[PDB]
Amino acid sequence: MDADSLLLSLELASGSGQGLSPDRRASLLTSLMLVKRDYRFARVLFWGRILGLVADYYIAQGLSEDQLAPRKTLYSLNCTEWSLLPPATEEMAMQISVVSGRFMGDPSHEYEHQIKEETRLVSIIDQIDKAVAIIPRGALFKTPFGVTHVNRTFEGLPLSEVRKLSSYFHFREADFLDSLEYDIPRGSWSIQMERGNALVVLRSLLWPGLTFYHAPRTKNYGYIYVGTGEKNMDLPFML
Amino acid sequence: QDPPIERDLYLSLEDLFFGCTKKIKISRRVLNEDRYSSTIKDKILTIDVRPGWRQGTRITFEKEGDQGPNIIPADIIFIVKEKLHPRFRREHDNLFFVYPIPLGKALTCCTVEVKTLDDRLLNIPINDIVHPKYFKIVPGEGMPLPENPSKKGDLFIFFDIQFPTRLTPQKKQMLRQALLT
Amino acid sequence: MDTAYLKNCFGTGLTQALAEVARVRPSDPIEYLAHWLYHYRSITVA
């Protein structure tokens, strides 16, 4: 989510209940502004949290012009001390498949199944972005120059279009993006209305902790993954 | 005929990263039809330095160098050469940074502060135990390629570990209990 | 003559190329032409 989600508690307004304290919120505002300074990103959205057993990894994601670029991930344990997380590949996706369990706060932790916790952080954040990173329909407009920009004239979805999974897009490489109605399982997405139905909350069931914010009246949107960081393989049993 | 003068001109990393321009005043040994004069017709040669030009890249100006009465002038202003920096060593489209990490920070979690050629600052995590052959690749963040200025190579961060110069006997017991167990 | 070969091969492309170059008047028309032909593929073939 953008900085507008850190001037007000947009995260906890979704009713998921997990988010940032005002301490972390103000610290994150200053730190993500400094990240946009130090790293010349077009925008610096707060990706979310990986709730560990010792400390939580506060995650930020760099956005280029060129928003479907291979987005650059950053991590921080004490919020402000932001550090450039390495990018993800297919080998590191295959590497962590033998490991299961909750994240440890120290990213130097080792698993004997060695495997670094930093590699787990990189791979799990990549998997969450490829699976359940949400963009509402029409928020991004494929520019004729081979580059994706913000559709800066985007009006929020009509309330008729709110209830359809077709009106929401996977924020990744592929109206250009893939819609959520093919995201198997068919019931894998939960759509609910809060705050007088001026608020659409769309939570991932396959990756619990994701909660996508959207205000239909305006263009205020964003997604945050605040959760344990594992994939709910039990989803078809649970549906 | 007489050879072209293989002039060497030094370019720092930011000049070859951003694609600067350079001017080199040339000789005044240009001949008229009389074939004994010494004048100049073009004082300055300009080279549009593009990003990613490697060392040894030859830029040649035919018919612009020194000229005798019956030979064709030529000149090879300039062979791309790299200045010393504080610090990245130029290799084939990759930058090699040396971080003087202290010991005790080498063996534990560390964050390396890298100013880049973009005037961007990087906090690179180092969660591995930094022995004196370790290097972390920060991919896609080196200098631009000469064949593609949009794409850039990888940044290599090597470590020069500073061992302690003196240890208390308490510090000797500290270390012996820690490392040898 | 070799007109017919290059009748078929280039046609509209060189026309648009030098039309744009004459309109713009860049400092290096030849480099502008080369870059424009590259871009002209990048729109047409793709």
Binding site: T30, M33, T143, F145 | - | H39
Partner: peptide, 26 residues
Amino acid sequence: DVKMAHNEYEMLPAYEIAETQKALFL
């Protein structure tokens, strides 16, 4: 279809406050 066919950088006064205010969180 028509849209088909050495750079300096400037930045706002909002990061000198951010430069100033990180000391609050350290």
